[PDB]
């Protein structure tokens, strides 16, 4: 089990955010590069799991990247963010982190969970 | 499985609203009276399982009442809002309806799940 | 200028809550009763001037409901709320209290704003 | 006055996210390029005026950052984000683009403002 999750929840209409690309990344130390982890789809309960091994989840910056407009696109609407980039800092590597997305065509929230 | 549950997240300390109390109220269609269904109190998780039985989850207008202002007392701080009660309106019961909670001092949010 | 204002924000279609109908109401300190000090209608850019004059605007638990069922219907489309009651303590009165709320159908938040 | 406005609020305190720097950038439409365009600091209402020139302000897509981990750490405290970035598109030229932040240490959110 993945000590990264998410979950992918459209406000507009009460539904999980199902079909929506999230790619993760980790920045490296040395030159700042976003190195490319795993890209994912959120399944009909808009999850994604397995994102990264507990071995991998090394302390450092984290990005993930929501494809927010192509989501939108692909239910026949458009967006106002073409995409989503959360950007957080990993210190303490035994904590499950949970970096969900709320989202309508016109807002989105985030928020850190266990 | 109680066909309604919920999930109080402490959003400016980004963990789990434990052991913070919700009552779950149903309005009476002949008066306009409220009554109470069943009294609760958040885990370790911030999840109140049992909320209400699916032979009680009928089709009507339920309140949530969630103890916000007991809640940050007992962490030692002041909230702004004394309680939240979430009104919502339940047609088709055979859904699940997750109603959680996302609170900081100063601010909160709801968005129905599934 | 009233000591409380509120803007009401369309968060599904990016647009001001025009035409929202809110009520202000103050918590008795005697009985605990809620007793109606006024009503208003947003306008278009969702906002609703002189709720309340600086002179009545006294120390106790205000209630601003939102009656965001009628609000959509009128968009043709239904809310999971049929309205949404924010419930706040007001102890120094000589501070700006804006008292917003962000909603599509099926969320909503709000923050205090100064 | 700018046709493009942001408001940062603390909503772990509740006050303007006051002192916050911002930087707005745009992206070129031939190459890959983020271009900056300001570089502001949000005043004691926790707004930045001047973002931009109404001539300046063509379609493309937007790109603001919120210096979020700086602003914490002035407060003596840490954020899980180190920035956040809100990246959106413009298409309708003449119309008023207000991109907010509402901000926690473990929490953000923006919604598009008329």
Chains 1, 2, 3, 4 share one sequence.
């Not at 993760?24 to 309960?45: C, F, Y």
């Not at 990247?65 to 990993?90: M, N, Q, S």
């Amino acid at each position: 089990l993945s000590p990264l999750s998410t979950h992918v929840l459209n406000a507009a209409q009460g539904v999980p955010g199902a079909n929506m690309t999230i790619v993760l990344h980790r920045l490296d130390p040395v030159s700042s590069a976003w190195n490319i982890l795993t890209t994912g789809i959120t399944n009909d309960d808009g999850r994604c799991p397995g994102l990264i091994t507990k071995e991998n989840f090394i302390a450092g910056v984290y990005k993930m990247r929501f494809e927010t407009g192509k989501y939108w696109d692909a239910l026949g609407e458009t967006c106002f963010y073409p995409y989503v980039e959360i950007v957080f800092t990993i210190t303490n590597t035994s904590q499950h982190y949970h970096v969900p997305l709320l989202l309508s065509r016109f807002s989105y929230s985030t928020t850190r969970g266990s």
